[model samples]
Every structure is written in structure tokens, then in C-alpha cells.
Target chain A: MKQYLELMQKVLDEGTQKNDRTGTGTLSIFGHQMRFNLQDGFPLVTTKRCHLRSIIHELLWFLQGDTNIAYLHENNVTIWDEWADENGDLGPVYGKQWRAWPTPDGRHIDQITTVLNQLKNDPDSRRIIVSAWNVGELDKMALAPCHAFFQFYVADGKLSCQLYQRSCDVFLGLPFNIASYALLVHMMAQQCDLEVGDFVWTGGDTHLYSNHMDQTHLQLSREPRPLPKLIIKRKPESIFDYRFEDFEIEGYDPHPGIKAPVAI
Target chain B: MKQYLELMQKVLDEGTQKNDRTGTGTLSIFGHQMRFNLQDGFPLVTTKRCHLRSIIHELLWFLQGDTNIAYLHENNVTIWDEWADENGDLGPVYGKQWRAWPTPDGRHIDQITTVLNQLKNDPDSRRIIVSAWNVGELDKMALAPCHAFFQFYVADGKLSCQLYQRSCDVFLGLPFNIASYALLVHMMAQQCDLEVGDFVWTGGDTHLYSNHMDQTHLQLSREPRPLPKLIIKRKPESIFDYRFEDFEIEGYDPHPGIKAPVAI
Candidate 1:
């Protein structure tokens, strides 16, 4: 996408050089946004052969509200392995915050269920938001949420979602983050029985690690391929009803996959 | 100022008709962002004369962890009076959520204090975020937070802030929202011994209410003047220690105050 590539170029051109927690220095920009209209096509990066498998399984894990890494291990997704403890617990990470945010008393709030209901019953309500930045529980999380918060909107019978990512590893994490949220939008729209609209991504501290600068330039040199179409093979009963088999991508042709070191 | 006016015009041009909880019809756009560099001037609206009294009092109140409207009442600011209960309580709103968010255990996390510490000690950290959209405590709030979440970023010896507003009454509340956050950026920078950067605002479901259309057009018709300067007479000992007497606005000249009915 031109929008995605432009951000890369912008960061290279104007971003400041800074040291980060990962010991991997970065060229970072403070705030930025990108929009993808679902009606056009799926927004997978075309300059590189990105795998959607990890994205899918990770989202499924989040939907299941499973914070432990056993499910991911069973599915051979090791993206989060580095961050997990010996017991493979991420401790109230994205899944727990999204699906079972704990209260001061002994209750849990299901943000996904609540937002889906809000979408169906009160589409115009501006408060249809799901935040993963649980202030009370931050100390317990292995890592603070990068895709910190998101909001959903409905207009013209189409559902749109916007994500506010407080931090982004642009080279490795941003593509996956975009795909995951975009897929979630499709799933939510289907469950709400509405058309898919746009997925607006707002990023804070968006950066490319120093080690990935070569990869970034290589990606920028390549011409973007046509966007692929996402085909959901079946209709799910609820937001959490979809499986790995339900999704199919058509007409995705891209350059060979580029390898980069994980910052952490 | 152009950024603010353009957002209003964009809503009229591209926004869908939204039936809101307030029952005031709105021309609303789903996602929008505006960036104002604080090095230029304070981000007060230059087209309309905006009063800073209520905004200052409200911010001080939030930092004081006062959910009741008594402090606000003593200062003659009634913006939140409609939401208070018989005891002048607003339940767990921005003040509570910002200063002391209750945990599942007995802990009460002070987000503002933690963020200021992070800013001073680890300026490059990406987890410097403060959130008021407490999923566990939403039901207890008199009104859900509209200017729900915000994050701080430090770079090149200047501090920047970005606020994610879940809903905006553009004609009525937006100017206040902008100035308040910008003021916060200045205050935080002062506390951390840094210069100010940019105040970036992101809005979801940004709208102009029907009743305020006349005011909006009248305001838009006027030319934007040079932005005014915010003079914090003295740096308070702590983030929570600022008072009404210590702040002043200089060179804010605009058209006479435009009277628009509040949505509530």
C-alpha cells in the first residue's frame, strides 16, 4: 500500500535517532495514521511475503482469552516465546485485557462482547471502545500493550475500526498488527451483519529498528503488488466463533520474504 | 486553528448523519487527527474567544482526585454539574481513574504520578500512557470519559502529548479539549525540565451537533489570528499542585464569544 510505504519513507526522512529498551536503536516518529478501506482489498504488505499464519493463530488465542503460551506453542507460533516466563505465562496480556479485564471487586469485564452488543444495538454510540491499556494491571503484564486501544464505528451500514498503538516496531510488528486488526474488523462486521468499512491505524512512537534499516530500504525499493482479497468461507455465530479454516486469501503475489532480527 | 477548522469542514463534507446518545443529530466523521506544535504557540482556537477558567479548574480537579463537583462549584465552573448526583458526586471519573485507579487487589495505581516519573527517569520509554477508560469501573462513572486516553512522548529535549478522544462535540467541546491537553503538555514539560513539543489530538466519531451548525459556520467564516501564549506564572511543586492564580493567557484576541447550546 502507498499509505504504508509512505510512512516508512517518512520515518526514514524525518524520524529522530533514539536508543530503545531492546538495545536496538531506532529511527522513530511520534505520531502517524494510515487508513485501509476493506471494500478495496485486503491490506497485507505486498513488497514482502508476509505470513498470515501467526497473525491468525495469535488473534484466535486473544479471542479465546488465553494469556498462557501453551495454545500458541501447540500451534507452533513462537513470536511471543521470548517474552514469556518459564511457565509461558504473559500475565494478563492482550487476551485477558480484551476479554476478562478484572475489577477491584471480584468480577471481569468482557470488552469484546460488550462492544459487539453495542455495535448491533447502538451503532451510532461514540463510546464503542475496547482498550487494552488497563492502568491498574500494567505492572502484572509481561509487556504493556503496543496496540493499546481501539474504537469501532458504524456508518452507512458499514463497520469501521481505529486502533491507537502506543508503540510499534515498524519493521516486524506493524504489518502483523495491521493484518490482525483488519481481519478482526471483517469478523466483527460479519457477526454484526454489516459491511466492512475502513481500518484506521494510529501509531505512537512508530519506529524502525536500526538493524532493520536495510530491510526497510529493500522494502521501499520494491514495487507494491495488487492487494489480495480476503474470503471468509463461513459465517460465524459470534465474534469468537471463527476458526483458522474459515479464512482464505486470494490473488496475493509479492516479492520474496525478507528476514530481519527481532528487536527483543 | 486551520487544523481545527478543517476538521469541522471535513465533518460537514464527508461525515455521515449520526443519531447520538445526546439525541442531538451530528454530522460525524469516524477517525481524525490534528497536530499542533507547542513551540509555535498555545493551541487555543484563534477564531473564537475561548475562556480558559473552566478548563484550568477542571484539570486541577482531575489532578486532585476529586470526583465530586464541589471544587468545581467553588470555582463557578458548572460544566460537570449536570452529571453529578445529589451529593455532587461523579463516581469514578477522570480524576479517580487518573490519580488512583483501583486494582483487583487493594492497590490504587496513580497513573499521573507514574507517567511523570517515567518522563523524568526514562524519557525514551514507550509505556508512558494514562488511561481513563477503566473497563472494570465504567458502570460506576456518572459519564464515561470522552477524552478517554492520552500518552506522552519525549524526543530531542522536548515533550509531546497525544490525546485519543473517543467522542467529540466539535463545535462546543473541541476547543476546550485542545487547550486543556496542550496546557497539560506544557505543565508536564515544565515539571520534567524539558521544552514543549507537539500536542497531537486523535478523535473517533468527531462530530458537530445540529444546533451548533450556525455557530460553527460563523466561527469558520472568520479568519484565524495568531495563536496566543499560555503563561504558567510558576511551576508548582508537583503535577497536582497547580492553582487558578498561577496561570495566565496573553495575546488571545478573537471574535466575541459565540453562544452555542451545550449538548446536555
Candidate 2:
């Protein structure tokens, strides 16, 4: 994760400062891309203590297309607690848009299923994309999407997924975002009988918010531990079938977790 | 323009071969980015005759957020003809996704308006984004989004936009996509009282289909015409208030229009 740490530091040290919607200012640059090959041993941030449990459950919930935070809370994941409604719903958030995005005709489209089929049948298809930026549904969402969309590419019989995250809270969300999508690529590859390829993260407003700068600096000071390995227990037949207990991580040793509050 | 042409030829000549969803196989590359400074003049493909008329109208249509082809067709723009339904409707396509994306409460969210507002109120906002990948409404559309999403950045009182297009038909679509967004950036800048900065095009599956090989080679052989000048007739108060006669292009001396079939 030296690459990850280096990128974080580079963006902070060199990125341009700008004001943002959160009333929290940002230092941003355009057209930055980072690639993480899964073969390089799961690209989890080792610079600080990164939790795989929340990442795992979050992904499972997304695959299920459940926008409500009920499952997340049930699984003891508080990452989304601040954004949830009183009923624990997050409206049509990531999962709903990925799995069952609602349409005008009382229909829903499952982008994940479509993408998997495209990989199996049309590996070179340029349109193999799954998006969560539902314009019509943005108001209904507790928050507009940060990780707005993602696309899949198949080359050399390996599947790679790239995420276009519109906004990122680098200290608190980026690591989890990376792990979740990397795991998604792995699972998608397993289902499609392809090897894991690469995970490319592209950001819009990728910034270390002012308040989180101290935490980010502290994280940068910590020595990076060796990356842990992820073991999926149940070999699910489909991308949507995997559950919480299906994932297991071993050899994760890190510095204590850092606390960073949400800017919203 | 030469660099753009060479890129098209190279991708066609050397890209990895794969089957695509369009039934036209492609030689594809993942995660490619190109930057064009608007200060260098309009980024038109000088190697081939690119009709600026259609590009301008299409952009205007998108800003209007009209998904139906009525407006496009009424203006004699037939570029979208191949993808429209019998009723000439594109079913909440680019415009709807950009302007008034549907929410669950039967209300709509205008991302374009929101983005313009963000650029004005918070010039440095990292969340200055306009997305067209309406996940919920994908299945109902005649075609899923190709130019999936885009974002804006502001610094030193200049506004720039970065587009994340998932696919590109280099010969047919890419140039238009480039110009459209660059124009978008300029218009956005005008609305926000800023100067036009840069337009960064980021691609997911940037590929030339196998069948366009000869055309690609021919294009590569031609020396590029000088970059053209795109002159908007006059600045409008709002981004959406521009008319057809309000835009003009000059100094575009190109070789000839290259004929290429739509992959669909």
C-alpha cells in the first residue's frame, strides 16, 4: 500500500485548494487514476488500521441492492449511521442503483446482473457499466452518491473494474471504497470464471477535508503493515448470493484505527 | 488533432481483440485520459470533417434535459436517429439524466442546474458533477449511456470539466464528445463568471472497432488541419438560454469527411 499512501500524500502536498458544497473546502486535481492489481495481495490500506469487516458487509449489502441501512446496522456497521433516516433507510443509495434502480414504468434495472452477463458473453463490450448516479433518485437518497459509478473491463481473460467516485472523504472512505470494489471485482471474476485483473479508482472531488487533515497526517506517519488476505467462505454461484459470513480475512495486523468525522 | 488521429489508428492497429455487446468486436484499452486546453482553440478533429452543427444542437438538447428526439429531429439533427424509438423518444436518456433525473417521490432533480449553482456558490467544490448514468432507467432507454458521467473543477477563477466516458467510437463519437464537453465547460465558465479552463476526457473502454481499420489508417495518414475556432455569438445570462444562431465555428479547414458505419 506504499502506492496508496504515496498518492494520498502527493494529493495533499501538491493538490490545489478549492471550496466545496459541504462548506468544507477541498484540494483537488482532475483526471487522476490509480490501479491496484488484486494479485498484489488485496490493496487494503496498511498505513493505518483498516477494517475489512465493514467493507465486506457493505459490499454484500450493495450486491443485495438494499439501500436501507437496516442490514448495515443489523450487521453492526456504523459507517453509514450518520446518513441513515430515522427508519434506517438511506433511500436509493449505492445498492439500489446498482441492483434495482427504479424506472418510470414501475420497473427496475439490475446493472450488476447486466454487467456480469456482458462479461460472460461480450467481454470486450465497452458498455459493461453499473452506475449509482440516479438523477431522479438523488433527492430521495439520504445523500447524493459519492462513488457515483463503476465500469468493468475484460482483457486477457481477466476482469477489471474501475470506479468513478464523484466525491471521496479520503481518510475515512477511500480505503473502504477500494477494498469493497476490489472484493467486488474478485467475486465477479470468480463467478465469470476469470482471474482478478485490476481495480482502477477515479475520483471527482477526491480530497482530504480540512478537519481530516490531522488524521490523514497521523495516518501517513504510521508504518504500513503487510496487506491481509481475504478468504470468501461460501463459494456463491452468483454475484448477489454472497452473505456476511462468506468473507474471512487473515494476517491483518495494523496500527490502531484513526477517527475522522463525516463532513456532512 | 494529429495526436487524436494517431491514437485512434494505434488503438485500432494494436489494441487487444474482444467481442462486444454491439455485435461489433473491438480492440480495447481501459483507463485512458487526454487533456485539451480550451485556450489552445476548440479541440475539433481536423483530420476529418466533423459537423459542428449537430454537436452544438445535441449539447443544447442535453442542457434542456429533453430525452425525446423531437427537439433534436426538429433541428435537423439526425445523429440520434439510429437509437430513437418509433415515437422518437429516447426515454429519459442524457437530457433527463443530466437535467431532471427522477426521484422516488415523483419529483425531479436537475443535476445541471445544481452543478452550475455549485460552480457559482462554491467555485472550488469537488462535487461539481453532472451525471447521465441513470441506473434506474437504463433498461427503458433505446441505448444505455456511452458518455456516462462528467465533473467540473474550478481554480483561479477558471472552470474546467472532466468527462468519464465508458466507451468511445473514436472515429464517430470521440471528437464530438470532446467538443461537446469543452463547449459545456466554456458555457459553464460564462455562467459562473469564470474563464474556460481545460477539458479532460477520461475513458473506460476507448477502442476502435475492428471493421473501421481502413478508415482509421486513412485518417492516420492525413496531416491535421489547424485547430478551429469556435465562437459563440454572444454570452447569455444563463447556461440554458443559448440558441442555435447564437453559436458559430470558423477556421476549420479539414481534409474530408470519413465514412464509417455505426457499430449498432
Candidate 3:
């Protein structure tokens, strides 16, 4: 993942140090883009040993449209523990917006289903998109979507997905995000009977926290290992039907996991 | 702009021919990004002389939250004429979604004001974004948003904006989109007491219409001229109060305008 390392180096080289909402200062750049071709292999960050178990469960939870942390707790994934309320609800976050976006006119739009249909029927469409940055519901969300918007494109029987992430925690969250989306692309392609293509990641306000400098440098110094191949054991009936047990990451050799503090 | 020309050239060289909704085929590429430093000058396309008159009017209209084409007609800008119904309305488009996005609970959120506040008070905030791709309201609109979501960032006292445009018509609409956003960055900088930074544009399914190949190549052949300086004569009381006469484009010398058919 030279692209991932390049982003880290770019931030360290030219990024401006700035104060942030979390009290931890950051070295930030305004805009950045990265692409991962899924056909080569799954885009798990090989420089650091990232846990794919959390990513897989998180993605499955998101696809299930569950906003509560109940499902996550059941699967022993506590990545979202800090943000959940006493009732275990995270308000109408990504899952709610992705699966069922509420309208002002008493209607709910299922963006996932809509995009899935478009991919099947109108694969050449320019409007095949799913956005989690619901303008009116920003206040209601526990955390505003960092991976805010995404679009899917199909050409030459390959499905490519591009995500517009409004903010990125480059050291920690980004690697997981890359793996999660690449996994989604693999699933989406399988469902549509298309080959996997690219997972293009675009970011705004991409930053490395001041405290993560040590971890950042450590990870940057390590060479990226060969990417792992994702094995989806079976194809389910729908995009939401896949289980965590249906997946495995083969040949994922990497450096030891680098520790970094979460900004939030 | 060399960036603009490069996009066209890249599309011509690497884009895949695909069928489109307009029945007009296109040579399309999935993901692309361009950056225009506002410190250099206004990023108006100098290859084919673009009309800043219409761009200025359309942006003003959008800020007004006016979805009707009557305001555009009053300014003699007919760019939105094709999409208007008999009532002269293009229902719940950028203007509505920008100025007043309706919530599920009947409250309307003013994203422009919210963003302006963030720029002023919380300049370091990563969540300062405005989205026009309201999934619930897409069916009500005459056309879905192409330049869909945007986020603002501030660093070193310069305000930067990044736009995520879902679909782009490279030969025709892209030039206008770039100039419009650049102009917005200028105005936004002025309003918030900040200097202008970069305007980063990211596109999803960026394409050139099949029939516009001649026009595209013609544009690619021409040498780019110096970018023009945008002169915003007076700072309006608010973002909503800017007038067409308050703006001027200086040092804009270019080749003749190339006419292309609108795909709608």
C-alpha cells in the first residue's frame, strides 16, 4: 500500500499543524485521493496488523441497518463503544441513513436497495450513489459520517465504488475504512455477477493527529507486505444477508500492529 | 486551465465508451480530481471562452434558495431553462437543499449559515459541509445533483473547499462548475475574513459526450491563457445579498466559445 504510506509521508512533509475539536492538534491537508484495485487483492493495510474481524462485523452491522450497539456487542466488536448512548443507540447514523433515509414528506428512501437495483438494471447510470451525509440529521448522529458519501460505477463487467470521506484519521481509522469498503466492493460485485474493480477513496480535511507522530513514523518506516486475498465463502441472497463467518483473509503477513491513540 | 485540458485529454485517452441515459454515448472514466489554487487567480477555463455572466447569476440564484428559473430569466441566464416545468420550478434542487434542507420532524436547516458560522467560530472543525444530494428528495427534482456534496476546511487562515461532483460533462458543464466553485471560495473567504485557499474538485463518473469528441479535441489542442482575476466589488451584508452587478472579471482573454448541444 504505497498509496497509504505516501499519504502519511505527504502529511508529515507538507501538512499544516492546526487545532481540532478533539483538543488533540493535527497536521492536516485539505484534499486527497487514493485508489485500490480489488482484483489485485483485498486492500488490507499490510504495514500494520489491522484486525479485520472488527471491520467485517462493522460492515455487516451497517448493512443490517442497525443503529444500536447491541449487534456489535453480540459480535464482540467494541469499536463504536465510546459513542453509544446509555440506551445503546447511536441515533440515526450511517446505517440508518444508508438503509432508510427519512424524508420530510413522510417517506423513507432505501439508498442501498436503490443503488443495488441501478447496478443490476442501469449499470451505466451516472446517478448510482449512496450518501450518508444527511444534512438535516447531522445533529442527531452520534458522530457525523467521516466516510460521508459514495458512488458506484460499472464498466466492462466490473463494479467500482468511490467513497468521498469528509474527514480521515489517517493513522488508525483509514486502514480499516479502506479494508471495509474494499470488502463491500467484493460483495457488491459478487451480488451483481460483475468482477471487482477499484475502490477509490477521496478525502477532505485528511489529517494525522499530533500524538500519532511516533506511530505514524513507525508505520511509515515499515515496508508494506503483499496484500491479502479475501475469501468470501458463499454468496447470500441479498447484500444484507452475508454473515461474518462467510469471510476469511488468507496470506496476510504484516508488521506488528502500531498503537495510536484515538482523537475522540 | 491546464488542469481542465488534462482532464479532457485523460478522458479521451483512457475513458471507456459506454451507453448513457441521454441516449448519447460517452467515453467515461470513473474517478478524477483537480485542484485550483485561488492564490493563483480565478480558475475560469481560458481554452474555450466560457460565459462568467451565467455562472455568476446561477450561483447568486442558488444562494437565494430560489429553485424557480424566473430569477435566472430576469438576469438573462437561460442555463436552467430546459429543466423548468410550466410553473418555472425545478423542484427542490441545489437552492432548496442548500438554503433550507427539510428534516423529518418539519424543521428546515440552513446549511450555508451553519457552514459560515463554522468557518468563523470553529475554523478547524472537520464537519463543516453542505450537501445537495438529498436522497429522500431526489424523485421530486427535475434532475439529481451532479456537483453533489462539498466540505470546507480552514488552515493557516486560508479557507479551502472540496467538492464531490457525482457526474461531470467534461467538455461543457465542468468549466462552469469549476469557475462557480472558485467564485464561491472567493466570496466565502471574503465573508469570513480569510484569504482564499485551494478549491479541490473530485468527480465520480467524469465523462465526455460521444458527439463532443471534436469539441473536446479542439479544446485539448489550444494553449491555455493566464487565469483571470475575479473582482468582487463590495462585500454584501450577507451571503444572500450579493448582486450580479457587484462582480467583474478582469484580464479574461480567450479563444472563441465552442458551442455544444445540451444533453437534456
Tell me, by DockQ, which candidate is best: 3
Order the candidate numbers by lDDT, best to worst.
Answer: 3, 1, 2
Candidate 3's iRMSD? 0.7
- lDDT tens digits by residue: candidate 2, B114-225: 8877766766655677777765666677887889778887777777787998888787889899988888887877777788888888888888877888898888888887
**Poorly placed runs, candidate 2 (over 4 Å):** A21-24, A67-70, A120-124, A214-228, A250-262, B2-6, B9-14, B64-76, B85-91, B99-104, B108-110, B122-126, B222-226
Question: Residues A81-143, candidate 2, lDDT per residue (tens digit)?
Answer: 887888888887888888787776567788888887788887776778877776666657888
Instruction: Provide chain B TM-scores across all predictions.
Output: 0.98, 0.96, 0.99
List ranges where model 1 is wrong by over 4 Å: none
Ranking of models by DockQ = 3, 1, 2
> How far out, in Å, is residue B104 in model 3?
0.5
What tens-digit string does per-residue lDDT give for candidate 1 at B18-87? Answer: 8889887989898899899998988888788887888899888988998999998999998987888999
Compared to the true structure, candidate 3 yields what TM-score?
0.99
TM-score of each: 0.99, 0.88, 0.99
lDDT of 1 by residue, A1-264 (tens): 788899999999999999899888999999898899999999999999988889999999999999999999898999999989989999999999889998898899899999988987999888888888887788888999889899999999999999999999888898899999999999998888999999999988999999998899899999999999999999987778899999999999989999999977
Error of 2 at A69 (Å): 4.0
| Cα RMSD over interface residues, candidate 1 | 0.7
Question: What's the lDDT of the predicted structure labeled candidate 2?
Answer: 0.80
What are the per-residue Cα lDDT tens digits for candidate 3 across B1-264? 888888888998999999999999999999998898999989998999998889999999999898999988888999998899999999999999999999989999899999998888899899999999988789999999989989899888898999999999998899999999998999999999999999999999999999998888787888999988989899998988888899889999998899999898
